[PDB]
């Protein structure tokens, strides 16, 4: 359990969310932008990813899982600023993947916004 | 000639670096080659000789 894991981020258009887990995903720790006193619409900032990443990573503490090999799963503004701020914790980011859900034209998306 | 759907090595230089199709704009093939290709690349997706995404 020590120094082996998968880091999941999915920054949407709001509220960059990060959950770090082991290599066979079991949700070791997680944090958000709402868990740092960002109430609303400040969460869609790269500066919100500057603190939300390591405050789940450094407050994991159960096994010393200190490698991540992060996974990106969202179109957001704080996308690459959550892995740049992950080496502020310094956890040897070794395999970056953009695993985002892309449909094969499957379902009907919602209405246009006037 | 005609593209056979088992001949993977000449057929996977046309697949993308994730599993998509390169357009003939960037590959450079002709018109009727590209759509004789695409009915063979998609029978090879169905029998797991090539993925849908990697």
């Amino acid at each position: 359990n020590i120094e082996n894991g998968v880091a999941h981020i999915r920054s949407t258009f709001n509220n960059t969310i990060v959950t770090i887990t082991d290599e066979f995903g079991n949700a070791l720790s997680w944090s958000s932008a709402g868990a740092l006193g960002f109430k609303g619409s400040k969460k869609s900032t790269p500066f919100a990813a500057q603190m939300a990443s390591e405050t789940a990573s450094k407050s994991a503490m159960e096994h010393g899982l200190k490698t991540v090999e992060v996974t990106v799963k969202g179109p957001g503004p704080g996308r690459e600023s959550a892995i740049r701020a992950l080496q502020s914790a310094g956890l040897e980011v070794t395999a970056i993947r953009d695993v985002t859900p892309v449909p094969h034209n499957g379902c009907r998306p919602p209405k246009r916004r006037r | 000639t005609h593209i056979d759907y088992k001949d993977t090595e000449l057929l996977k230089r046309f697949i993308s670096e994730r599993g998509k199709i390169l357009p003939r704009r960037v590959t450079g093939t002709s018109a009727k080659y590209q759509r004789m290709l695409t009915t063979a690349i998609k029978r090879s997706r169905h029998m797991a000789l090539l993925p849908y995404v990697k």
Partner: protein, 52 residues
């Protein structure tokens, strides 16, 4: 899905920023933010082809 090692993190990003821009992820989900009408994408693709 590309592994980048034997370097820093500020150079693996430079690989990853152009390994996403040369992919149908960001231009695909920006297209499907809202349902467009089935005859206005045929003109949207026509404007994205006549300009090249």
């Amino acid at each position: 899905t590309v592994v980048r090692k034997n370097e820093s993190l500020e150079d693996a990003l430079r690989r990853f920023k152009r390994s996403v821009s040369k992919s149908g992820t960001i231009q695909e989900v920006r297209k499907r933010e809202f349902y467009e009408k089935p005859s206005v994408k045929r003109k949207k693709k026509s404007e994205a082809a006549r300009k090249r």
